[PDB]
Design a protein around this ligand. Sequence first.
Ligand SMILES: O=c1ccn([C@@H]2O[C@H](COP(=O)(O)OP(=O)(O)O)[C@@H](O)[C@H]2O)c(=O)[nH]1
Ligand SMILES: [Cl-]
Length: 282
Amino acid sequence: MKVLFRSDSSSQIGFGHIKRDLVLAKQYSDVSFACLPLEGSLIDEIPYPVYELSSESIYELINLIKEEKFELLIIDHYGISVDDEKLIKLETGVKILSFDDEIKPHHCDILLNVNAYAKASDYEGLVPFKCEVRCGFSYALIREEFYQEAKENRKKKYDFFICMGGTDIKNLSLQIASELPKTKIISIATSSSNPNLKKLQKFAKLHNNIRLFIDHENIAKLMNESNKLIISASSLVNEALLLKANFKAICYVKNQESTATWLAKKGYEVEYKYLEHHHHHH
Ligand SMILES: O=c1ccn([C@@H]2O[C@H](COP(=O)(O)OP(=O)(O)O)[C@@H](O)[C@H]2O)c(=O)[nH]1
Ligand SMILES: [Cl-]
């Protein structure tokens, strides 16, 4: 099939949707993306045709599907609703694979929840009658380096690895690093789309126990070189699970609660305080 991904990335949205979509894209031969141009997006990192959307109009997406005759639409977008999915189906007849991370209803032909917590039974009554439900770690979308890395034995170089996802809008990385002993060696990974980058670099430069890695190409290596991870309850969790890492999870935003709950149940430390509004910036 000709496949279209509808997915955004930005400083605000984070990188998780596009990054996992790029792993999924390797499953298909004729791939395109439809993206809004947004500040801090990964559009320049997407090695496929990227249709630039001029608006958030669901009809603009429908027009693109009809005109280019896409046969599979992969939706990985918290802003595309069940009603939007229904409308796409009605107007185009395209097959729809929808990502879900929170246990919400979708009108799709395949429901994909790549998170370890997820069970097909979570979606009873939440999907259409002919929907194939794909849930759990057997459907993890993880970059090759993590598989390559779970094989190698590395010497530990860091006491802690901190990664709050691609962009860390609340600057939790600074707050979290500030709580740790000055004698503990701390790696921090973030991207150049982090809107707190200048402040984080200033902070890091003052503390010789902190090593900041910007736009690092091998997060797996950094994790495997670290004794303990402190990570958001996001894509990083599946990555850490594959590497059998010791980690504490931060429930960054409400959408991460399903993962957070499961991790607590499994005996991992899970921190919820940063959900509170006074932690919106550091
Ligand atoms: O500096 C970084 C920080 C994160 N990541 C990767 O980007 C993804 C972040 O997605 P996630 O769902 O964890 O968080 P989001 O960015 O959506 O908030 C994960 O696969 C990380 O391994 C990366 O390549 N470089
Ligand atoms: Cl890959």
